[PDB]
Amino acid sequence: EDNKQFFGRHRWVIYTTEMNGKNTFWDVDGSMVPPEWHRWLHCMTDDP
Amino acid sequence: SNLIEVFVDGQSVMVEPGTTVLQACEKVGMQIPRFCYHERLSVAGNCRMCLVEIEKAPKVVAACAMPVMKGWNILTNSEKTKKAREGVMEFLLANHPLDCPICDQGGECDLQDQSMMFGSDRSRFLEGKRAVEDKNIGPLVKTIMTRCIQCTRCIRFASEIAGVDDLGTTGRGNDMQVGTYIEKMFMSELSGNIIDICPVGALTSKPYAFTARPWETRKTESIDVMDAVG
Amino acid sequence: EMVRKCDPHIGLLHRGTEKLIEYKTYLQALPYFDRLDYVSMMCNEQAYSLAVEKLLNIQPPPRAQWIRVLFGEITRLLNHIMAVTTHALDIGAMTPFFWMFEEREKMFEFYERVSGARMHAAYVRPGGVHQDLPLGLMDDIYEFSKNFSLRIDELEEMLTNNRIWRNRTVDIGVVTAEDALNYGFSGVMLRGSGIQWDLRKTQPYDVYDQVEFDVPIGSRGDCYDRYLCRVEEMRQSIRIISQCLNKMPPGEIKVDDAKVSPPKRAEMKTSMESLIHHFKLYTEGYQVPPGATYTAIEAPKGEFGVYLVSDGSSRPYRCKIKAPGFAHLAGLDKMSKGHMLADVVAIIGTQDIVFGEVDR
Amino acid sequence: TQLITVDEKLDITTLTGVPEEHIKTRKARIFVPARNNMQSGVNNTKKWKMEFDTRERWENPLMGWASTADPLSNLVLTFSTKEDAIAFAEKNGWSYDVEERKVPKPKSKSYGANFSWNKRTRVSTK
Amino acid sequence: TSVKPIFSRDMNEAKRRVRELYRAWYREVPNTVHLFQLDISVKQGRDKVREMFKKNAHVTDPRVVDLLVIKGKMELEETINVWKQRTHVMRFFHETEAPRPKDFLSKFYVGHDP
Amino acid sequence: TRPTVRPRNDVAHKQLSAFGEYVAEILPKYVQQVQVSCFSELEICIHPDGVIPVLTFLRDHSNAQFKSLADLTAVDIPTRQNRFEIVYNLLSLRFNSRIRVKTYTDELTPVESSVSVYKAANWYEREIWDMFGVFFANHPDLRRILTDYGFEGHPFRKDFPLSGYVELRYDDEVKRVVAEPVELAQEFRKFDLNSPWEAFPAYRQPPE
Amino acid sequence: TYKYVNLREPSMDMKSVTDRAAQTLLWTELIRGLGMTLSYLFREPATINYPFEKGPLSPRFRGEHALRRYPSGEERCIACKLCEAVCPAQAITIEAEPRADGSRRTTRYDIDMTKCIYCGFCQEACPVDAIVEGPNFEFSTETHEELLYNKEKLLNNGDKWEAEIAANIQADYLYR
Amino acid sequence: ASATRLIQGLRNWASGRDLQAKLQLRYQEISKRTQPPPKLPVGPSHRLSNNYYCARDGRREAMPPSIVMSSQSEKKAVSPAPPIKRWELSQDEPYL
Amino acid sequence: GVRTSPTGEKVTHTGQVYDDEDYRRVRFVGRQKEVNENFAIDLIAEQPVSQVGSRVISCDGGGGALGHPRVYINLDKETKTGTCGYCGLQFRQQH
Amino acid sequence: LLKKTTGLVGLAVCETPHERLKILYTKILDVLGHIPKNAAYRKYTEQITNEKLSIVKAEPDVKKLEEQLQGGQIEEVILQAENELSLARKMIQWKPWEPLVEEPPASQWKWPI
Numbered sequence A: 001e002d003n004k005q006f007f008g009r010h011r012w013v014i015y016t017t018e019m020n021g022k023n024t025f026w027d028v029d030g031s032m033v034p035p036e037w038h039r040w041l042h043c044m045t046d047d048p
Numbered sequence B: 001s002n003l004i005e006v007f008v009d010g011q012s013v014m015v016e017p018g019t020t021v022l023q024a025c026e027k028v029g030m031q032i033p034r035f036c037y038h039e040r041l042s043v044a045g046n047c048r049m050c051l052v053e054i055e056k057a058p059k060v061v062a063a064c065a066m067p068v069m070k071g072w073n074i075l076t077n078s079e080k081t082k083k084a085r086e087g088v089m090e091f092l093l094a095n096h097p098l099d100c101p102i103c104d105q106g107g108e109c110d111l112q113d114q115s116m117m118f119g120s121d122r123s124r125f126l127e128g129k130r131a132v133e134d135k136n137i138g139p140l141v142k143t144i145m146t147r148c149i150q151c152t153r154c155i156r157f158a159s160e161i162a163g164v165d166d167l168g169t170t171g172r173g174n175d176m177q178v179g180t181y182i183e184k185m186f187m188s189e190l191s192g193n194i195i196d197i198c199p200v201g202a203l204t205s206k207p208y209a210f211t212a213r214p215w216e217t218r219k220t221e222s223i224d225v226m227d228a229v230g
Numbered sequence C: 001e002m003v004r005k006c007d008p009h010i011g012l013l014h015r016g017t018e019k020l021i022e023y024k025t026y027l028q029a030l031p032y033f034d035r036l037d038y039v040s041m042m043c044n045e046q047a048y049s050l051a052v053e054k055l056l057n058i059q060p061p062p063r064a065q066w067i068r069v070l071f072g073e074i075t076r077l078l079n080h081i082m083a084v085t086t087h088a089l090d091i092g093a094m095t096p097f098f099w100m101f102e103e104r105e106k107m108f109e110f111y112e113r114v115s116g117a118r119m120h121a122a123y124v125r126p127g128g129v130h131q132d133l134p135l136g137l138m139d140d141i142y143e144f145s146k147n148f149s150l151r152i153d154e155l156e157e158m159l160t161n162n163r164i165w166r167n168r169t170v171d172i173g174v175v176t177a178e179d180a181l182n183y184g185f186s187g188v189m190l191r192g193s194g195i196q197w198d199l200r201k202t203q204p205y206d207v208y209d210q211v212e213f214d215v216p217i218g219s220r221g222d223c224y225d226r227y228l229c230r231v232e233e234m235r236q237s238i239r240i241i242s243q244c245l246n247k248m249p250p251g252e253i254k255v256d257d258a259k260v261s262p263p264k265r266a267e268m269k270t271s272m273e274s275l276i277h278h279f280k281l282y283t284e285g286y287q288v289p290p291g292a293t294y295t296a297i298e299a300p301k302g303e304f305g306v307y308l309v310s311d312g313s314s315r316p317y318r319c320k321i322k323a324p325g326f327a328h329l330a331g332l333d334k335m336s337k338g339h340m341l342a343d344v345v346a347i348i349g350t351q352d353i354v355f356g357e358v359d360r
Numbered sequence D: 001t002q003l004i005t006v007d008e009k010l011d012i013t014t015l016t017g018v019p020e021e022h023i024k025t026r027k028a029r030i031f032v033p034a035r036n037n038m039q040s041g042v043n044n045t046k047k048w049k050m051e052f053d054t055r056e057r058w059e060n061p062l063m064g065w066a067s068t069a070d071p072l073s074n075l076v077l078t079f080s081t082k083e084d085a086i087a088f089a090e091k092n093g094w095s096y097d098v099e100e101r102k103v104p105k106p107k108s109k110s111y112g113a114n115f116s117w118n119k120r121t122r123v124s125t126k
Numbered sequence E: 001t002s003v004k005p006i007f008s009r010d011m012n013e014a015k016r017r018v019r020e021l022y023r024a025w026y027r028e029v030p031n032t033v034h035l036f037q038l039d040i041s042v043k044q045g046r047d048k049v050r051e052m053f054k055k056n057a058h059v060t061d062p063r064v065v066d067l068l069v070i071k072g073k074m075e076l077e078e079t080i081n082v083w084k085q086r087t088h089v090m091r092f093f094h095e096t097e098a099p100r101p102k103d104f105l106s107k108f109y110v111g112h113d114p
Numbered sequence F: 001t002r003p004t005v006r007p008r009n010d011v012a013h014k015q016l017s018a019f020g021e022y023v024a025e026i027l028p029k030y031v032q033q034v035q036v037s038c039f040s041e042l043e044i045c046i047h048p049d050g051v052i053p054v055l056t057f058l059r060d061h062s063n064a065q066f067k068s069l070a071d072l073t074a075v076d077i078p079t080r081q082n083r084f085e086i087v088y089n090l091l092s093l094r095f096n097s098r099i100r101v102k103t104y105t106d107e108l109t110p111v112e113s114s115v116s117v118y119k120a121a122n123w124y125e126r127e128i129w130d131m132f133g134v135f136f137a138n139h140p141d142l143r144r145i146l147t148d149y150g151f152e153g154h155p156f157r158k159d160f161p162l163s164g165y166v167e168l169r170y171d172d173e174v175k176r177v178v179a180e181p182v183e184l185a186q187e188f189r190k191f192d193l194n195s196p197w198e199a200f201p202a203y204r205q206p207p208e
Numbered sequence G: 001t002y003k004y005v006n007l008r009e010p011s012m013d014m015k016s017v018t019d020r021a022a023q024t025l026l027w028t029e030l031i032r033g034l035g036m037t038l039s040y041l042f043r044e045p046a047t048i049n050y051p052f053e054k055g056p057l058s059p060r061f062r063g064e065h066a067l068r069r070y071p072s073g074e075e076r077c078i079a080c081k082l083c084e085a086v087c088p089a090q091a092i093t094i095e096a097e098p099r100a101d102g103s104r105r106t107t108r109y110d111i112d113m114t115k116c117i118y119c120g121f122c123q124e125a126c127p128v129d130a131i132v133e134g135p136n137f138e139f140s141t142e143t144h145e146e147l148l149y150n151k152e153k154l155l156n157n158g159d160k161w162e163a164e165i166a167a168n169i170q171a172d173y174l175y176r
Numbered sequence H: 001a002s003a004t005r006l007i008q009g010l011r012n013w014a015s016g017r018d019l020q021a022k023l024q025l026r027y028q029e030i031s032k033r034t035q036p037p038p039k040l041p042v043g044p045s046h047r048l049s050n051n052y053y054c055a056r057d058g059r060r061e062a063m064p065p066s067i068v069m070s071s072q073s074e075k076k077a078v079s080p081a082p083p084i085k086r087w088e089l090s091q092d093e094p095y096l
Numbered sequence I: 001g002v003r004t005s006p007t008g009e010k011v012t013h014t015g016q017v018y019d020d021e022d023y024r025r026v027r028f029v030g031r032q033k034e035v036n037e038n039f040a041i042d043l044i045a046e047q048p049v050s051q052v053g054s055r056v057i058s059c060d061g062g063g064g065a066l067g068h069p070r071v072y073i074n075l076d077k078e079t080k081t082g083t084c085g086y087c088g089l090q091f092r093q094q095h
Numbered sequence J: 001l002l003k004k005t006t007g008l009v010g011l012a013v014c015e016t017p018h019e020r021l022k023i024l025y026t027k028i029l030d031v032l033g034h035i036p037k038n039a040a041y042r043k044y045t046e047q048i049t050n051e052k053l054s055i056v057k058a059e060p061d062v063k064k065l066e067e068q069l070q071g072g073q074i075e076e077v078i079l080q081a082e083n084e085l086s087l088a089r090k091m092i093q094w095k096p097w098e099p100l101v102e103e104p105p106a107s108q109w110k111w112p113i
C-alpha cells in the first residue's frame, strides 16, 4: 500500500514466482489473487 | 315462469327460486372469491370469504349459502365487501406457514391468488404461528397439515362422493385438526381427487413431489384409456 | 466532389427487440431498454418506467423521484461526452476523446456503486428505484462535479475558438425551422435551429419543475450551433446536479404498494403477506390495467417515446419504441445535399446517432 | 367508384412467407382452454385459444437440454369468438379442428338439505 | 364483397403485370450470373425463375397477385443494384441441405414427421 | 389515496374532451370514435379513407397546429377482420398537446401514404411494411428497411414465430454464409403466467 | 429560461478588428491549443498497472455466478425455480427431485453464461440467498462449451468464493 | 500532487488556469470504501391502524377510457390547451 | 463421501455416472470430470439434533435476514425429530 | 423598430405585417364564402379568423400585437394564416361536412378483446 499515490495506484500486488507448481516468474495472472485479498485489492473495503 | 328479479351492481337478472347469491353473480359473470364452496359438494359456509353486501341491509351475508330475495341489490365491489375480504384474508394468513418456495401448490395456489387479488399487502401479526403434526394417509397423498385452512372439503368429499367417512375434524378452537385420528390410510378408488380439491398445499401428490412447477408445464388435452369410461 | 443523393441502409443491428418484449413480463422487459441507447442507459429506463407507472395509476416516492432526475443528468453528461468527443474523433481531433473519457470512467463508478453494473444498470424500475444510495455516494458526486467545470473548459479551449474546427462546422447541415418540425426532428436538432422547445420545461416529469436550468437556443441551425448547444447542456447538467444534491429528501425508494413493487427482504422472510407478494411478483408479475399510452421524455439524443399497449395480463401486448435517432437519420439525405464527401461524416456526427436505437 | 368485386375466398398463404411444410402438414386445434383443477378461478376460460400439434423434442448431447426443429411450437393465438378463429385458420390455409365450449351446468344448492328429515342427503358431520 | 383494388381492376391487368415482371427477370438473369461471379449457368437461373413463377401460379385474387408482383419488383430492384451479396442470390438454390424424403417409407424410417 | 396513487388532471381531461368534440364536429365524414383515457390521452379513431384530410386538418388548422409527427405504429390484432391498427401520434408545440389518430386495415387493402403531410412518415410507415405487409399507396420509395434482403415473411405479425424459419451458418464446402431451417439447441420455454382470477372489475366485459 | 448561444455581434472599431487580424495572421488560438496540450503533457497520467493494480469496485458488483451453502454444509437452494422464472434471457435450467433424506433439492442447475445478461434478478429473487453473483470477472475461457456451467461448477465456484461473497452480502444486505 | 513547483508553474502557465486547485486524479478527499451500517426508513403505509388497502389501491381506481363521441348552437371554437407562454430570457447568463 | 465407478469415473451427489458403453465419455478424454467433493446430505448428517423444551420451535437458519424464511416446527411425535424444511436442521423435545 | 431577426432559421423578417395579415385574413374569408353555412368548420374558422382580424385591425403596434395575439412572432402568425388559407382550399376540395362514409365492424374499436 502507498496512500500518497492517487486512487487506483494506492494498493498493488507483486505476484509470486511459483504458484501450484506453475512457474509464474513471467506468466503473471490476474486470477492468482485469493478471494480474501481480492476484496482488499479491488477496493471493496479498507481492512486487509 | 316463476323466475324472480334480482340486481347485481344495479343490473337486473332473472333467477330461479332458491338460487344463491354466488350463483346469481356467476350468472351475471362475476366470480365471488371462495375457499370452502364447491359446486359438486355440499355447502359448508365457514371460510367466510364469500361475504358480500346487500344494499339497504346492515350485515354482510355469505353468498355461498344465502338464497336470493326479490328486489335484492348485490354489491360485489362495494367498500365494506372489500373490507370483509381483506379481514378474512388477514385472518386466513395469520397462522399460515411461510412455506411458499418449498410447497408444491406454489404458482397454482388459490390462497396466493386471492391474497394477491382481494387481500391486503402486509401483515400485522406480530405473534407466533401455530404448528400442526403431520399425518400419514398412504403413499399417494403427501400430507402437510400446517398449511391447512380447515375448509372441510376433505370430509365432504370423503362422505358424499367417495363414500368412505374416514376423515374428520378433531379438537376445538384453534387446535382443530383435519385427520383420521388414528394410523389409518385413506385408500379409495377416488382418493387422489382430494389433491385436486384442496385449495392450499396441505394435500399434494406424492409421486409428483418436488418435480415441476405449474407455470413451466405444457397442457395437452387427451383421453384416458385405463378403463372404458373414457 | 459534391453529394447529390444519400441512401443510408439500416437493419445491420435489428435484433427484433420489441417482438421479444411481448413474450416477457414488465420486469423482464426492463433491461431491453438499457441496450437500445447504450450511452444513455438510465434515461431509457426512466422513459419505460414512466409509461408503466402511468398505466398502473401509481406514482414513485419523492426520494426516488430526485434520484432518477439526479442520475438522469449524470446520464446526460455521459451521452454528451460521447456525442462530442467521438464527433471530433471522426473529424480528426482525437486528443479530447481521451481527456473526457477519464471523466466518463469516474461516472461509471457511480453507476456500479449504486446498481452493481458499470453500464447496463437496470436500476430505474416502475415504481421507483431498485436500491437506495450507499453511504458516502453523494459526497463523491459532489467531489466529481466540483472539478468538472474545468474539464469542459479544456475541451472548449481546443475546439470552440479553433479555426480548423469551425471550418468543418460553420456552414454544414443547415436546416430550417419549418423543415425540422415536418421531418420529425427533436432535441438539439430543433433547439439548434432556434425553436424554443424542451420536454423538461414544457411537459415536465417527476421533479424537473422544481429545479432551475437554462435551455440553450441556437441561431443558424448548423453543426457549430448544435456543437455549442451540446456543450452548454453539459454546463446546465452540472447546475441541476448541484440543486439535486442540496434538495434530496429522506424517505423510501419504492412505491409502498407491495402488489407492484417487491417488499424488503427483511419482511419477506418474516411476514406471510410479503412472501406471497414476493413469490407472485417475481414469477407472474404485476397485472397492468388495459389501455394504451405514449410517454416521451427528453433523452439526451432527443424525444424518446414508448407506445405501450396492455391487455390486462402481466405481459405487454405491444411495445413500440420511438427513438430520436430514427427520424434524424431520415433527414441525412436532405441535410447532406450539396455538401462534400468529408462534410457527410460531420453530419452523421452532428446528429448523435446510436444504431442500437435506430434499428431497435 | 374506385371499387372492384372479388368473390373468391380469401387465401393469403403465398404472402405470409411460411414454408409449405408448415402449411399443409399441420393440424390447428381451436378450443377453449380447460380450467385448471387446482384452482377455482374461471378467468382463463374466457377466450378461445388456437394452437398447433406437438412435434419431436429430443435431448441435447452436451447438456441434456430440450432441442426441437418445429418453429410453431410456442405459437398460441387468442380469439374472442370461435368464428374469428375459424376465419383466421381458413385465411392462412391451415387444416384445423374445432371443439365446442364446455360450460358447467347450473346446479341446485340448498344449505337446508344437509339437515333433511328423511332424505339421504343428511351430512354425517359438519 | 366490394373491395379497394391495389393496382388492377381485374385479372387481365394483373396478368399483364406478371408478364412484365417475368420479362424483366428473364432479361436480368444473365447480368446477375456474370456480375456476381456465380457458379451456375444462365439456364439454371432462368429455370429457377420459371420454377418460382410456376410455384406461385395457383392464385385467383387480383390483390394477392398485385402484392406478389410488388414483392417480386422489390426483389428485382434489390438484385439490379448491388445490395444482395452472393449468398442472398444463392438463397434460392438450396445446396447445403440434404434432400428431404418424399415417399411414405423413407419418412417412416427417418422419424415421426408426417 | 394520497401517497401511492397518481393524481388526476381534470382540467386537461375537460380540455381534451372539448377538443375531441370540436374535431368530431368539424369532420363528421371520417371520424368514428373519440375517447379520452383516464390519464388524459385523446384518441380519435377514424375511417382509413380519411387518413389524408384529417391529418392535414390537424397539421394546418389554427386551433390544432399538430406540426410534429412523433411516431407511427401498426398493431396486429388477429381476432378482427381488419387485423392491422395503424396509429399516428401528433405533437402540437403551439398549444403543447398530443393527439392520437387510429385507422384500421387488413392485409390486402392499401393505405394512402401520409408523406405529403409529414415527411418523417416516409421512413416510418415504410418500416411498417417491412414489419407487417401493410401496403402504402403513393409512397415515394417503399421497400424493406430492417429485415434481411432475402427475408420472406413479415416478422411482427402475431402468427410469425419468435425464431424464424431459417438461420445462417458458414459452410466451408461452398465457402459461403448459407441459410438452413432453424433447429434450436434449447427450445424456448413457453410460460403460462396468467392467473385464473379476475384482477380489474372495472374492465369486466359483459357475458354472452 | 433560455440563452442565446452564438448570437454575439463583434465590435467594428479599429482595436478589435486589428486584434482579429493579428489573431488570423499570427495564429493565436493555435498557440492556445498547443499550450493546452503541452500543459497536459506534464500531468501525471491516470494509467494503472494491470494486472498488478485493479480498478475500484463496490460490494454490489455482479460478476460470476455461484451457489452458496448454509454454515453447516447444507446447500441453500430448495429448488423453488424462482430464478429460472424471473431470468429474462432464460439462461437457467432447473430439474429437481427429492433425494434420499426427503429434502427438496435440485438434480440439475445449469446457467448458460453465454445467454446470461448479468442482471442480478436471480440473486434478488432468491428467498434463501442461494444463487449469487460473485465478484469474479477474470474468468474468460478458450472454448464455448466451457461457458456452460452445471450444478457442480456453480457449487465449486461457491466453495471457492464464499470467503468474499459472505463479506459482500454482510456489507450490502441492509440496503435490500 | 507529487509534481515539483517548477513543473506546477509551467503547467499553470501553459494551461492558463490554476490546475492544483482542481485535480482530476482522486486522493484522500474521497469517501471511505467501508461505511457504517445504515438504518433505512419505512414508507407511509407501514402502519398498524387506518391502513386498509381498499382506500389506497391505485390500480383499482383506473377506469376504462370515457367515450366522447361514438357511432354506436353558437359555441366558441376551442383548443387542446391554452396557448403556450413565451419563454423569458435568462437573467443569469443570456449570452448577449 | 464420493465413490468411484468401475470404469474409473467419479459419481456426483446426484448419482449421475456415464455407462461403460456410453460414447459421451469421450468428452472427458484428455481432460477431467468436474465434481463437487462436499456432499450436502453427508454434511447435514453430522449436525447434532438440538434438544428444546417447548412444543413448537422456530427456525430461520441463523443470521436473521441472512437465513431462510422463518418456519415453525411441531415436535409432538416422540418417535422422530422435527426437521426444518429449508435448512435440514432437526430438533427434539426433551420431555 | 426594424427587428433584426426572427430567431428562426429560414424564416425571414417581414417589413410590413399589418397589411399582409389583413390581406391573408380577407382572402381566407373570401375562400370560406364558398363552404355551405351549416358546415361547422366554416363557422368555427370564420369566428377565429374574424377575431384575429379584429385584433390585427385595432392595433397599431407590432410587439404588443404579437404578445396579445399569442402566436409567437408575427412572421409565424403570417405563416399560419397562409397555412389556414391552403387548408381552406383543400377543405373545399375534400368536402368533409358530409355524413359518415362507412360504419366500422361490430368489435372494431373494442379493447381488450
Ligand code: SF4
Residues within 6 Å of the ligand: B096, B097, B098, B099, B100, B103, B104, B105, B106, B107, B109, B110, B111, B112, B147, B199, B200, B201, B202
Ligand atoms: S399452500 Fe399456498 S400460501 Fe400455503 S405455502 Fe403453499 S403456495 Fe404458499
Ligand code: SF4
Residues within 6 Å of the ligand: B147, B148, B149, B150, B151, B152, B153, B154, B155, B178, B197, B198, B199, B200, B202, B203
Ligand atoms: S387439507 Fe385442504 S381440502 Fe382438506 S380441509 Fe384442509 S384446506 Fe380443506
Ligand code: SF4
Residues within 6 Å of the ligand: G083, G086, G087, G088, G089, G090, G091, G092, G111, G115, G116, G117, G118, G119, G120, G121, G122, G123
Ligand atoms: S443475472 Fe439475470 S440474465 Fe443472468 S442468470 Fe441471473 S436472472 Fe438470468
Ligand code: SF4
Residues within 6 Å of the ligand: B101, G076, G077, G078, G079, G080, G081, G082, G083, G084, G094, G122, G125, G126, G127, G128, G129, G130, G131
Ligand atoms: S431462486 Fe434460489 S432457492 Fe429458488 S430455485 Fe433459484 S437458487 Fe434455488
Ligand code: FES
Residues within 6 Å of the ligand: B033, B034, B035, B036, B037, B044, B045, B046, B047, B048, B049, B050, B051, B062, B063, B064, B065
Ligand atoms: S365460500 Fe361461502 S363461506 Fe366459504
Ligand SMILES: [K+]
Residues within 6 Å of the ligand: B105, B194, B195, B196, B197, B198, B199, B200, B201, B202, B203, B204, D038
Ligand atoms: K392441493
Ligand SMILES: [Zn+2]
Residues within 6 Å of the ligand: I059, I060, I061, I068, I084, I085, I086, I087, I088, I089
Ligand atoms: Zn431452518
